[PDB]
């Protein structure tokens with residue numbers, strides 16, 4: 001009858017864009033509820049613009065806070081909307097606090113929850129993302145798993161097979177809908193040329209990496225060392241959480257002092273795809289960037305002790321180095337010489353359309 | 363270092379009482395956070411009094427509301443307390459919204475959660491209690507399962523065996539600590555004699571039974587019919603949710619008009635144990651009452667389509683009849699002739715002490 005998409009953050013907007021593209025080709029009555037978990041223009045507005053997405057019908061203006069504060073406000077405010085609008089399906093993507101809050105509200109209202117990117121596991125169930133995803137999976141009526149590994153994760157937790165659909169990851173659709181747009185846009189090319197030929201691309205924002213000063217210090221030390229050993233320039237797109245933490249721990253001024261590191265504010269998706277595509281290698285703790293690196297055939301080094309997309313490591317596209325600078329140094333050598341051929345485990349880029357078809361039929 | 367018990371409702375207070383008794387015999391620094399989900403004196407204060415429990419250190423005064431509103435306020439307010447007090451273990455009992463909120467706050471703060479009465483499943487994961495219990499189990503560090511069935515439920519959902527302890531149900535301790543107290547107290551005996559020799563005892567409050575008018579009507583019809591067929595008096599302890607719904611659906615005046623039904627306001631635990639012990643049979647949709655009926659060797663008829671304590675049906679103590687008056691009529695005949703011998707699957711009444719020992723050692 002009626003579908004509500006609930007989203008809050010940069011990666012959700014990007015990964016829901018192919019679902020929105022598919023919904024636009026149907027007669028389905030649907031709208032977006034934005035929690036405004038993310039609110040800075042370069043974390044939010046820019047994606048609605050570049051991805052040609054409609055304005056949310058509801059903006060809850062929750063923003064930042066501690067987990068209980070933020071999630072609690074979300075339960076209160078999302079419920080007010082769902083009690084009024086009464087959709088019969090709620091769609092949430094991924095593993096943010098917005099996802100959990102949307103699913104929890106819907107489940108108690110007896111509204112079917114469709115979870116896009118279901119079944120991913122790092123088995124670091126101490127991570128807030130792992131908590132969010134596990135809990136959401138257990139109250140979902142449709143579990144859209146990106147891979148057979150994810151499906152098997154769900155089966156091992158006793159979830160009924162008829163709820164699970166292996167549809168690929170919508171990030172393939174997004175990277176495939178937008179890379180050629182980025183490549184053929186003169187403004188995007190001009191941005192790229194203003195910022196950049198040999199470089200490593202870095203993003204870092206996991207709570208467990210940037211909220212912990214000695215882990216953050218270790219990673220910064222590691223980056224300084226990569227630069228000296230390999231004589232490589234680094235382009236660092238800096239998440240606002242990470243900027244705040246770097247300043248809190250007095251590490252920010254040391255990065256800006258390093259003339260081989262170019263620090264840039266968060267950029268739009270088209271701009272970022274260009275930075276990824278052209279990087280000699282990608283260093284990250286982002287979930288989506290691990291996937292994009294794999295899709296774009298650019299070697300990835302993941303600054304985490306584990307990942308919830310192990311298929312990237314399994315196919316040879318990615319290597320985990322955590323906090324450890326020696327592991328990081330060795331990984332750079334390995335990946336610098338790595339042939340950029342590997343399988344893509346995440347599907348053929350029509351996941352959004354498949355998800356909408358499944359929800360249409362039920 | 364420090365333990366926080368978080369509770370909100372009548373059944374939690376009763377089932378946590380043996381844990382409190384055990385904690386009092388130790389040097390552990392512990393206190394109670396009360397969400398005040400329940401607040402009426404006969405749902406709350408009376409249990410703190412009769413069970414000789416200390417005043418909560420914190421009262422959050424959340425009270426009633428819809429699920430998102432109530433749970434959301436709980437996340438906000440519980441987090442404020444836990445950020446200040448910083449316990450290293452949080453104990454929650456059962457499956458109420460208070461349990462889920464406490465566990466969710468603690469999990470994101472990286473505080474170990476101990477779940478008392480873990481692993482129970484009705485597999486009606488559309489029930490709010492089933493949602494609460496499943497989600498809580500998946501973020502718990504200690505899972506205190508009452509039976510091997512419950513342990514197996516947890517294992518089937520992929521939970522690590524080293525987190526699971528089959529300790530029995532603390533309701534055995536409570537029924538065993540308090541029945542002899544009730545029996546030897548003159549005021550309790552006087553209450554019993556004022557209210558009551560042959561009767562059936564009824565309680566009914568599941569959301570799915572009392573919020574749904576035609577289900578509630580069906581059950582009331584069923585009770586009227588039992589009375590006529592078996593010529594039996596009914597004592598009905600009426601939960602405040604149920605009173606509100608009966609009046610909303612214009613069924614309350616019909617019950618009060620039935621001279622074979624004695625409607626009583628909710629009573630204290632000592633008083634209720636006496637009513638249970640002396641009933642010819644018990645009719646209920648309560649979780650705790652199903653257990654107590656089994657423990658007290660009084661036949662039980664459960665007005666639900668399923669139960670999360672199937673061991674009571676398995677040992678012959680209980681039968682499910684749902685909404686169906688014909689099933690109810692047949693069940694009364696069966697249970698009226700049932701020999702009051704069966705196994706007790708819920709342990710030997712020292713679960714509270716075992717739980718505290720486990721938390722002490724880790």
Ligand SMILES: CC(=O)N[C@H]1[C@@H](OP(=O)(O)OP(=O)(O)OC[C@H]2O[C@@H](n3ccc(=O)[nH]c3=O)[C@H](O)[C@@H]2O)O[C@H](CO)[C@@H](O)[C@@H]1O
Nearest residue numbers: 009010011037038039040043064096097128129240241244
């Ligand atoms: C618990 C949770 O849901 N975490 C998600 C959140 O992390 P993220 O780190 O963004 O978590 P928050 O939404 O809590 O924001 C953290 C901090 O970043 C700053 N801030 C955030 C948003 C903004 O528009 N402007 C701003 O300045 C604030 O200082 C804020 O306190 O989004 C990430 C995407 O980028 C996801 O990978 C994370 O899974």
Ligand SMILES: CC(=O)N[C@H]1[C@@H](OP(=O)(O)OP(=O)(O)OC[C@H]2O[C@@H](n3ccc(=O)[nH]c3=O)[C@H](O)[C@@H]2O)O[C@H](CO)[C@@H](O)[C@@H]1O
Nearest residue numbers: 371372373399400401402405426458459490491602603606
């Ligand atoms: C979702 C949830 O956590 N449900 C639990 C809650 O149900 P319960 O039915 O009590 O659920 P609520 O706490 O939401 O209260 C429901 C209604 O009962 C009335 N009311 C409630 C409490 C009170 O002290 N006074 C009062 O009058 C109010 O009208 C209120 O709106 O407690 C029961 C114990 O009895 C448990 O079996 C349920 O699992």
Ligand SMILES: O=c1ccn([C@@H]2O[C@H](COP(=O)(O)OP(=O)(O)O)[C@@H](O)[C@H]2O)c(=O)[nH]1
Nearest residue numbers: 011014237266267268269272286287288289
């Ligand atoms: O300056 C940037 C950095 C990242 N991204 C995109 O952000 C997404 C990933 O989001 P994020 O790293 O914030 O979160 P995570 O995937 O770890 O949840 C990917 O699709 C990136 O292409 C972007 O558009 N601009």
Ligand SMILES: O=c1ccn([C@@H]2O[C@H](COP(=O)(O)OP(=O)(O)O)[C@@H](O)[C@H]2O)c(=O)[nH]1
Nearest residue numbers: 373376599628629630631634648649650651
């Ligand atoms: O008038 C009453 C009715 C019940 N109880 C006790 O309430 C507990 C069960 O709580 P409830 O039925 O409200 O909730 P549930 O067990 O279904 O969560 C049992 O221990 C009962 O003995 C009580 O003390 N007085």
